[PDB]
Amino acid sequence: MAALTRNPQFQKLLEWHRANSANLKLRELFEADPERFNNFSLNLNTNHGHILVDYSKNLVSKEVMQMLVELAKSRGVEAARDNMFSGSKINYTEDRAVLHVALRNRSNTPIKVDGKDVMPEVNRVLDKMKSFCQRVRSGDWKGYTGKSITDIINIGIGGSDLGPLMVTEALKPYSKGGPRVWFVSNIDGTHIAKTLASLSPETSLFIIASKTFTTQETITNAETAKEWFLEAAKDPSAVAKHFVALSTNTAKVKEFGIDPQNMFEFWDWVGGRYSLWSAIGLSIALHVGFDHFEQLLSGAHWMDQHFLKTPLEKNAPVLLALLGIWYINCYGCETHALLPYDQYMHRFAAYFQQGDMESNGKYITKSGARVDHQTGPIVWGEPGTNGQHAFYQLIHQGTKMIPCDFLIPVQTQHPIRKGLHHKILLANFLAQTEALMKGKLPEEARKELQAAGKSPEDLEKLLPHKVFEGNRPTNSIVFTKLTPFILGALIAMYEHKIFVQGIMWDINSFDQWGVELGKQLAKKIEPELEGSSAVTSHDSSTNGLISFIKQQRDTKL
Amino acid sequence: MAALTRNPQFQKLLEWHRANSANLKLRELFEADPERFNNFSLNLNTNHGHILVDYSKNLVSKEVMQMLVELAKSRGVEAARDNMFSGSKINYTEDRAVLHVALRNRSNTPIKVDGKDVMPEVNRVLDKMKSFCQRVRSGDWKGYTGKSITDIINIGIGGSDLGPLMVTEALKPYSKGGPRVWFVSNIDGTHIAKTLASLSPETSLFIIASKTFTTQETITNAETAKEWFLEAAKDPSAVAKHFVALSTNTAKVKEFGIDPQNMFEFWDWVGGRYSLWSAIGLSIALHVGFDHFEQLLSGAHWMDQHFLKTPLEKNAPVLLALLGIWYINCYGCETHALLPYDQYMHRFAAYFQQGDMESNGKYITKSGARVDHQTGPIVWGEPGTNGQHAFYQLIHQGTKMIPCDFLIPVQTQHPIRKGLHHKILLANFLAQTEALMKGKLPEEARKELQAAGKSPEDLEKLLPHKVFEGNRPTNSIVFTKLTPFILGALIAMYEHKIFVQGIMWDINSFDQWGVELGKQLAKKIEPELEGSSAVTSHDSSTNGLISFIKQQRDTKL
């Protein structure tokens, strides 16, 4: 088998689930114990706001949580965590350290890789970012015609795109005095074309974000941007005023033709999907200011320390991870929904789609043996309250069990109409998890149908449609306000949740070998699309699709 | 038990799956039969472009498809379809017709509800929309200070938001000469506040989109917009130049203060999640022009006729539905991914997340029986190529089976760099489904590692991580260009897929009693948030979360 399934604490948990999980009813759990909320929630005081992690509306008892914590211990979570933090090469397939925690290590306590403290270099790049932010935001950095920069365009994909995008969206209220920020990522020419259409070459600065500086989408987009720029500037030396690079590849940055002083470095132990805390966050710092960027780092650092110092039984990312294991490996739930009741957080779910799914969508363990159990879930979601009108129908009355995290700030960035909108938002946030837990009983629905003037025949037929089984588990994560600090803490919390799950599954959360095949096959097809010749080199579907492309591309509509 | 599980053709299908499905291997299926693509694809000529539905990379044989079509016939799909199209009240829990097909019935063949043809009123409202669009887009319609309208703002949620949003995004290239369009939907005050911050009351036209005209988010947002407007205009008569309504509720529209001449009517047989074809599409028509809106309707009409007149074995929405049943009810796949390789289509997946999940996230059948089988899947996705860098790791190398629909236009709206970007986009579109199908055997990966110069130790360590199991099924849907017509056909195709699945499961695809419950929920909690006193009226979690809100809302950060 695999490490997890051979573990006796896991076997005990699974056997308990088989024998007892039918006895678990949320309504009954709360009725039996008025201390349930108190015993199944964590109220974290960060000194810069509180984060309440309420996991009480979950299908767990004291005994279940105990079994889960014991499993985390016997799967080596505590030791694995310490190994990450100390710079051990825990990304074992690539023989790399995993040190996004170093990027936000505000204490500056030494963290060594290959015997060398990484903190001086982390801080050197941060200082460079701060200086660049001053130059650009002040208007001192001039474009090729001597004008101040008004627009910043990040060009990158995946880990070099989603973090900065999600964070600048979430922290929009903190962007006064900052340039407008744009994100180009898709190779689809629509993306760069529609972006450039709204910009002036005189006042636009491009940030080319790429760990490797070889990613086809990013370099192609970058070259398109440069061509557009040079059409107006007509001077190759002006490129240095309008293009900067975030990379680990000094040589490839030079080949593109960017000034070496224009390069903001990061390191191989910064995974792309854990990179917003590094030089990759330059567009964040430019947009909201370096002070706010430091606050974002500080929030993450707080959560890192919480994760490092806290006994597992009251350790927020550990508990979230354990609940996920319970639902994935015992209940067999394929998915996990992230439902922020916050428009600014509209890209939060998409961010953790990558963070979670690219990390833990794995099937080979440390020993090289194939898993014989589920690993990472499919992560999805949209902001509330919109979901209530759109897919919550299925959450309430479908045939799937879907663990949901509901998230909301207590304080809104826009307290319009004396707080009326936020009052309603909060009320919906609370009511939805309550409804998911409680459902609606036949006796309740029957009285409603009776009062609505339904005939005995109509009542009889309608009744089962109006009944809600409930017993649908949720987490509620509530925080004082969505400030840069609190957002940093929240992102770090989910990073560590993902880490804990990966350790428990015995997989590598930090590689991504699954990207290779698609890239190889795309390289083969690209040159085949050019010209009129029939393509026969693939399976009949691929060939047939190419034939359709060649036949349809000249047709005038 | 339920209709589907009691059905002998379904039990035959399921038994066949049990005995034979493990022997279905895509790589080998294609090798054995050069005609596979030809036998498992539909090349539809609409006379306004082609739509190729290539379903050959699915885990199916001729026999499987035969059994599925037989099941569809046994479940009375054709009769149910005819009943929808004829105006029968197939929404049985609400006693309503289901007539989104009437909205786009370009043929004008009578469709009767309660003995009366609905087409005259459909066309009267369309004519009203056409006239209004001409007046606004020409600049003739003037605001309260005598200026032309520059911005239109749709206020609505769910079915009154997502359709027009997705379509205006998808058809952005067709919006030259139209006013800017904004969508406000969330009750979260951020949504309206940030929208209004960018607008002038003098040049903004608000569209209040609401079937009932009682939805809390929409009416609150509308009242907020009206207050903001009147703060500037200071004249109630000015509202008639700046507010229109899309509704079925004349009385409530009047009560809000909107002119009856400013009301664009629709009907109870237009489900919200099927409503973009109605008056609800006014923001589409304003943005891209009425002619393009008519083309959108015409494309849907083409697909309606395809669905109505085509034998099941060659009927695109039917085949898509049947493949879904195969994966849902035989393989047990919880989810369905929609992956359009088109930035303009960035909200397409979200739209059908609503359309599918709200329709078929049900568990009571027409007979009143609780289903003892799965119904609607969780629908999710993001546009390619970004997904390849976000979550495709899990699709390729996770532990979940995930049916994916890959979609792309042959012709791009922006053929920049002499088509270079689109060439790369197409190459990735093709490569990804090829990769998911083919995988990479241990021996193939071994040879690659050997060629790369890996030592026996390093090779053995890396090998299992480099293996792709493949056999991951996809649909490829390729179309000449994403024009208004073709988009209309594509949306209608998925509408009918959803319909067919609903009939086969014996559920009502057209009610939403879970969504209806949601609108009953927050009212109780609302007044409890006011004041400093503790709330004890709920379960301890709801109580505890309310306590946290009250304790945290005054803290300065």
Ligand SMILES: O=P(O)(O)OC[C@@H](O)[C@@H](O)[C@H](O)[C@@H](O)CO
């Ligand atoms: O930053 P690069 O080298 O251009 O790579 C861009 C993306 O492919 C990359 O971020 C990818 O999402 C993952 O490896 C992140 O963990």
Ligand SMILES: O=P(O)(O)OC[C@@H](O)[C@@H](O)[C@H](O)[C@@H](O)CO
């Ligand atoms: O359009 P209304 O009445 O304001 O309702 C707004 C939404 O609740 C409504 O569209 C909901 O998404 C579903 O019923 C659509 O099928």
